Amino acid sequence: IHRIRITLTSRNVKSLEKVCADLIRGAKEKNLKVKGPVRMPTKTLRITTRKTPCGEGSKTWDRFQMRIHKRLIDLHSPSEIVKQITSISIEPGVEVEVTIA
Amino acid sequence: GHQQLYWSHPRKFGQGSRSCRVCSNRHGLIRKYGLNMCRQCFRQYAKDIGFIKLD
Amino acid sequence: PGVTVKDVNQQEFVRALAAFLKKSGKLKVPEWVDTVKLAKHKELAPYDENWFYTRAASTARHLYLRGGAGVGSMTKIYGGRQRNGVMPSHFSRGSKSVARRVLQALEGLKMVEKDQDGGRKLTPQGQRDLDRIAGQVAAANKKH
Amino acid sequence: DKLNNLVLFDKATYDKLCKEVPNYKLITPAVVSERLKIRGSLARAALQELLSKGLIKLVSKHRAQVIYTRNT
Amino acid sequence: LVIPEKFQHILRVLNTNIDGRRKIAFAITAIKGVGRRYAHVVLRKADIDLTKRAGELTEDEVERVITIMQNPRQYKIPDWFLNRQKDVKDGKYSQVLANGLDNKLREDLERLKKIRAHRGLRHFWGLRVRGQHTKTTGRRGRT
Amino acid sequence: RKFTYRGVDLDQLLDMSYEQLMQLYSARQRRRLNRGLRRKQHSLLKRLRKAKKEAPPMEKPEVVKTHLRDMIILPEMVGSMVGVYNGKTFNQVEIKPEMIGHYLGEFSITYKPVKHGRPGIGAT
RNA sequence: GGGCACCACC
RNA sequence: AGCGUGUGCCUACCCUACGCCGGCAGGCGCGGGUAACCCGUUGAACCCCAUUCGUGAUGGGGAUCGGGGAUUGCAAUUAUUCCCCAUGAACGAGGAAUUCCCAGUAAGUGCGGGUCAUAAGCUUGCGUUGAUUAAGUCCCUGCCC
Ligand SMILES: [Mg+2]
Ligand SMILES: [Mg+2]
Ligand SMILES: [Mg+2]
Ligand SMILES: [Mg+2]
Ligand SMILES: [Mg+2]
Ligand SMILES: [Mg+2]
Ligand SMILES: [Mg+2]
Ligand SMILES: [Mg+2]
Ligand SMILES: [Mg+2]
Ligand SMILES: [Mg+2]
Ligand SMILES: [Mg+2]
Ligand SMILES: [Mg+2]
Ligand SMILES: [Mg+2]
Ligand SMILES: [Mg+2]
Ligand SMILES: [Mg+2]
Ligand SMILES: [Mg+2]
Ligand SMILES: [Zn+2]
Predict the structure, then answer these.
(1) Residue E41: its chain C contacts at CB < 8 A?
(2) Where does the record place the modification N6-acetyllysine (chain C)?
(3) CB of D28 within 8 A of CB of D57?
(4) Which residues of D in 32-51 have their CB below 7 Å from strand H's atoms?
């Protein structure tokens, strides 16, 4: 019995929510205690550049943006069941980190 | 000798210590988030990196 | 029917507390109070020669409202705008050696003590003194 | 032309202040300065003295503007 | 609030004329080499009320102010306040005043000119001295 | 009439060490000396000392040329002939006692003073 | 001869 | 208040709380943060309440210069930047001509990012205070049917 935290980081929300739902369903099918998923504030990286490769013309700017989303799940359980439920969780684009506090 | 003089000038800071990681150009460099690209190379590779234009 | 600090006007409270500190006579005053200005964005020295007591009263009131402030926090509290010639103005902080000496002088009166986390806070004696001053201010305001 | 205002009261100007100002129906440091050829600081000091003596009512006090009136 | 019987409308201090109608703190700033900070610290050191005009002062107060202004280092005025710290020729800290300042600046320029340093040459030619651009500004005063 | 640098004459200056001279100098020279001199400045000092030793008793020392325009003039250099590179030519400078604390580049100008001609067609 | 625009006007 | 940044393949260079020293720029210690966790409840500036000044190129304005001190760097002179005394120029609202703007807008006021060993009078964003005028036309300018 350990307090185990799962942190999920992703760039798109559909895959992230699908993975979170899968983990919650899998854990609750084993009659476990789950807290979350608690959603951290979204991070927005911005890069503003000039469009022209030279210095000629109207001053126009590109505004590129990247969004990072983060979820937390808490589980009171032994390590083996967590790895059992986590093995399926592998999804393209989602970074899953499991820690024992 | 030549071994001492060649490349002796320190290059631990300034424009001469930094260059683009794609074309080795020292002008218009982007250092935010550790990109280390010039603006043209970044505009060329932005979609591959993951920067999208939403506004 | 007990008056607390938040009930009364804050400016009159600061004036009364400064008068109380000056009349007490146990506050320690630096030697250079008459030759210094309070920040680098100020142009002149303070108009009031008994400015040290006023600053000590303000510091005590701030520690009452929000405890645990250090020298940097007090420096940020009393910072203001700096005009610099033909260039745009910018925010500028106060002098650290004044805030530090005000805090030390207040600790010499057994009104301010070191905080466990860091910084300084008020002792129960300092809180009692501030509440008594607030009661006096409220009574003076109501009677007149 | 240049404006040369007195910085310290004279006998005639002090008599003027004591006799005519308390009947102006609108007393203001700018008004007294313009009528008695006095600087603003001396006018403010004189008005504070008259208020202390009780010869003039005060209507409102502000850093920008102080307003006085004659007694009822 | 009435004017005192003995009132000095004009004072003569250090070959300078002082307006007796100005407040004492800003009246003595008419002396070359005395500014608001220095005048205020000198008057605070002389225990003279700052709420009175220059003409209301007695002769004792005026001579005390002059004495304190001439010799700051005796009266606990710090060295960093002075405008002629660490003289090149003799190494003495002091505050220089109306005519002394005028000839001290002249000697400072002459030293640079005689040694033929770049700053002295720029002073001699009449051009800017602290590295400013001269292409577009500073035209005033030139033909 | 006798030269003094901040109340100190030339002989005492020559006797003093670098730590004593740090307090006489200004903030920039003091910081430079506190950070220390490198090999090239020491080589220049050695060459100047060698040149001054070989001077005839009534003659001036041989001119020593250098590119070091950021060299600080020490009291030991007074009386030496230094050619300072300005980018194109070595200008000859005799070190006077009143140059103590300045740089060498302050005495070899790097540009020709402007004498203006008639403005061209492209000026309006 | 019509229509539009605070990179036009009122 | 709000938007954001923060210890980096090469690559050296991060954001800073608290205690002491200095009048200030700064210097010493000793901690947190790879971050809704620490700076940070981001005690911002205008604004508000009192004090002094009193139509005086004035305590408006802060250019140009003198002497000192400290930080970044291998190196500061042709002043990198910063701090302290001192000096105290034009300027009293701007000719012909001409720019931008219709609601949380114009303007005022600060704060982040880029550049950045040192670093904003520029740019790109963010808040805070907050309007006058107009709901029309083809007269000027220009573009289309
Ligand atoms: Mg403030
Ligand atoms: Mg300004
Ligand atoms: Mg003066
Ligand atoms: Mg320059
Ligand atoms: Mg010019
Ligand atoms: Mg119009
Ligand atoms: Mg003036
Ligand atoms: Mg002025
Ligand atoms: Mg200097
Ligand atoms: Mg040049
Ligand atoms: Mg000044
Ligand atoms: Mg137009
Ligand atoms: Mg900005
Ligand atoms: Mg910056
Ligand atoms: Mg630019
Ligand atoms: Mg038309
Ligand atoms: Zn490139």
Answers:
(1) 34-35, 45
(2) 22, 110, 114
(3) no
(4) 33, 39-41, 44
Q: Output the six-digit token pair for C85.
A: 């010639």
Cross-strand pairs, F64? F82
What is the number of alpha carbons within 13 Å of residue D11 lying toward its C-beta?
1
Q: How far apart are CA C70 and CA C61, in angstroms?
A: 14
CB hemisphere CA count around D1 (13 angstroms)? 2
User: Which DSSP symbol is given to A70?
Assistant: E
Report whether B37 contacts B22 (CB < 8 A): yes
Q: What is the largest distance, in Å, between two alpha-carbon atoms of chain F?
A: 63
The SS3 assignment for C52 reads helix
Domain ranges for chain B: 1-55
- Domains of chain E: total: 2
Residue pair F93/F82 in contact (Cβ under 8 Å)? The answer is yes
Asked if the Cβ of residue C100 lies within 7 A of any atom of strand H, the reply is: yes
The resolution, in Å, is 2.8
Closest by CA to F32, choosing from F95, F97, F85, F101, is F101
Burial of A57 (0-12, 13-18, 19+ CB in 10 A): exposed
Q: Which residues contact E1 (CB under 8 A, 6 or more apart)?
A: D8, D9, D14, D42, D45, D46, D49
**In chain C, what are the domain boundaries?**
1-144
Give the span between the Cα atoms of C112 and B5, in whole angstroms.
63
CA atoms within 13 A on the CB side of F61: 21
Burial of E130 (0-12, 13-18, 19+ CB in 10 A): exposed
Q: Which two tokens stand for residue A66?
A: 């990247």
Measuring CA to CA, how many Å separate F100 from each of E86, F71, F97? 15, 11, 6
Q: A interface toward B at CB cutoff 8 Å? A: 11, 45, 47, 49-51, 53, 62-66
Strand-pairing partners, residue C84, are C87
With contact defined as beta carbons under 8 Å apart, do C95 and C141 qualify? no
Judgement on whether residues E53 and E94 belong to the same structural domain of the protein: no
Domain of E12?
1-78
Structural method = cryo-EM
Cα-based angle F75, F81, F87 (whole degrees, multiple of 5): 105
Contact F28, F102 (CB under 8 A): no
What is the SS3 assignment for C83?
strand
Query: Which ligand is nearest to the Cα of residue E129, counting in written order?
Result: 4
Q: In this structure, are residues F48 and F80 in contact, taking their beta carbons and an 8 Å threshold?
A: yes
Tokens of F109: 């100008």
| Cα–Cα separations (whole angstroms), residue C3 to A66, C131, F75 | 54, 7, 74
Helix (H, G, I), strand (E, B), or coil: what is residue C115? coil
Chain centroid, CA E41 distance in Å:
13
**Chain F residues touching residue E90 (CB < 8 angstroms):** 4, 6-7
Per-domain residue ranges of chain D: 1-72
- Do the beta carbons of residue A52 and residue A60 sit within 8 Å? yes
Task: Report the distance separating Cα A60 and Cα F47, nearest Å.
Answer: 60
